[PDB]
Amino acid sequence: WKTAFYAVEKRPMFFEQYEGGSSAWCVKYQFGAEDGGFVGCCEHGRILQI
Amino acid sequence: PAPSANPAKIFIRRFFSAGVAKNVVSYSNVMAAQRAMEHPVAFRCLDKLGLTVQSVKWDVGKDPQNTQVGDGGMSASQRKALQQILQRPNPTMSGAQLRYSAALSWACFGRMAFKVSVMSDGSVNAIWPLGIPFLKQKFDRYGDVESFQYGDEAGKETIPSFTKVEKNDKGRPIKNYAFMIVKPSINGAMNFDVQNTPLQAIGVPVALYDALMARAIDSADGTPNSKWLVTASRDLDDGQAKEVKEGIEETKPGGDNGGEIIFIAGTDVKVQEMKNDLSDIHSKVPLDDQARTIAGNFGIPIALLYDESRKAFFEDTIEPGYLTPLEDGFSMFLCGAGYRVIFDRDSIPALRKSRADIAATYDKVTFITEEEKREVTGWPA
Amino acid sequence: VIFDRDSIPALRKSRADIAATYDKVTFITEEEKREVTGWPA
Amino acid sequence: MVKLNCRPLCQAPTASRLVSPPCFICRGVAPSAP
Amino acid sequence: AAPSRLVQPGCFICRGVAVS
């Protein structure tokens, strides 16, 4: 797995008070994250079926 | 002592996420630092700054502000061994090369990292600098970094930080750790902040510089280097017009009738001499200005690229931008209180005359004891 | 909290000269000759 | 703006079977007959 | 890759006595 499939992370999970759309009586929070993944060389794995 | 509760918890909440081993330098900055080593002026200032800091000589010594009578020179043998490594680091490298690479990485990224191999009793065994582009670190829950990851898949040495590591009964560590010396910036975020590098504010003029030099190298080859655009008239009998060409042509240096006049009987030919200025190909005026900007941003007097400017460059940017932070970083966690790493000022060849006269004039004063006359110009005791 | 002015590398020359000329003054006690250029006591 | 909220007064059970890998057979025995 | 089979040896015992 260390070379058959890679995991991509760019920017971790984050929150922030969304200034704008938020008034003196109601808050609007906004969270986000940026990540992805792909296969490496797929001659390194194997699958069993029926 | 340590209360373990810093106000840096404002970022691990949501601005950051624990246990992720984030990289310390953005890849754009690494590429900018890599290509800045190929640029003529950017490399020149870089290797100058690296060279000067590399020249200073290290030593461990008693610190001046030694109010801690409970000296932290715990063994006086660890301090002896610490002197050994500062003069002879990890094999196949000297202390000079360590100073050069440390200052270079600090100038390029605003960061300094190292690795120690303390044997079992506070006696450091060797020092290794760490490649800053591909060094990743992971933070704790409260406010700080605990270990550094060095390598993607095979390299997985989660070398602990100096913060959490197996300490001796007095406080000295027993196993490896790293330093991660950082340069401060706005809005705090001691370790979560963005880097602070001159490379942050030199993107535009270097782009201007390479663009103009691209114009320069391009128009150098491509503009004809010929003169005397001669043109014939529209009744000239090719068979004798060629005689006109060979007549004009056979005047070159090392020609039979060269330097004599050209006589054309009838059918007036007209020559015009091309200017071919080619003396402003690189745009001299808007090129030195870009060179000055990428120089001033690194903190180097233009005159260097007279002795007054050299003394200024030594005691205004190099000293309080590379020498003081590196010295304070090592002094913070490499040895106990009361003792710290020092470098000799008199080892700088540009400051020798200044120190000399300062020493001479102080000698003339009388309402000052001898010991304070010493300490004001080095010379501890 | 105090920071020592003589730690400024550019200020060393003037402090050196200002101390030398003060040494030549005579109608002034030693203690005030000190405090005028640092050096508390 | 009403936002409803419902919680079945009564509940109910949930049964299921526990089929398990059978006493196996092997595909092809050497000493045999057509 | 196309799904390849995983044929294994069966119950192999004898080479010298055919069954009646």
Following DSSP, what letter does each residue of D4-31 receive, concatenated? -----SS------------S---S-BSS
Distance CA B278, CA B216 (A): 10
Burial class (CB in 10 A: 0-12, 13-18, 19+), B166: exposed
Residue B236: DSSP 8-state = -
Collect all residues of chain C within an 8 Å Cβ-Cβ radius of residue B359.
none
Distance CA B44, CA A19 (A): 46
Burial class (CB in 10 A: 0-12, 13-18, 19+), A9: middle
Tell me the C-alpha to C-alpha distance, in Å, between residue B228 and each of B231, B243, B265, B307, D28.
9, 17, 20, 51, 99
Collect all residues of chain A within an 8 Å Cβ-Cβ radius of residue B14.
13-16, 31
Interface contact flag, E14 D27, Cβ < 8 Å: no
Query: Locate tokens 């007279």: which residue?
Result: B306
The alpha carbon of residue B318 and the mean position of all alpha carbons in its chain are separated, in whole angstroms, by 10
Q: Report yes or no on chains E and D touching (3+ CB pairs under 8 A).
A: yes
Distance CA C37, CA B71 (A): 32
Q: Find residue B23's DSSP bridge partners.
A: B136
Distance CA B290, CA B305 (A): 13
User: B34 — alpha (psi -120 to 50), left (phi > 0) or beta?
Assistant: alpha
Q: According to DSSP H, which parts of B221-369 are helical?
A: 241-249, 285-296, 307-313, 324-332, 352-364
* Residue D10, both tokens: 């009564």
Neighbours of chain E (3+ CB pairs under 8 A): D
Would strands B181-182 and B111-112 be described as parallel, antiparallel, or unpaired?
antiparallel
* Residue E8, both tokens: 């294994």
Interface contact flag, A13 B153, Cβ < 8 Å: no
Q: Which candidate, A14, B358, B255, E19, places its Cα nearest to that of C9?
A: B358
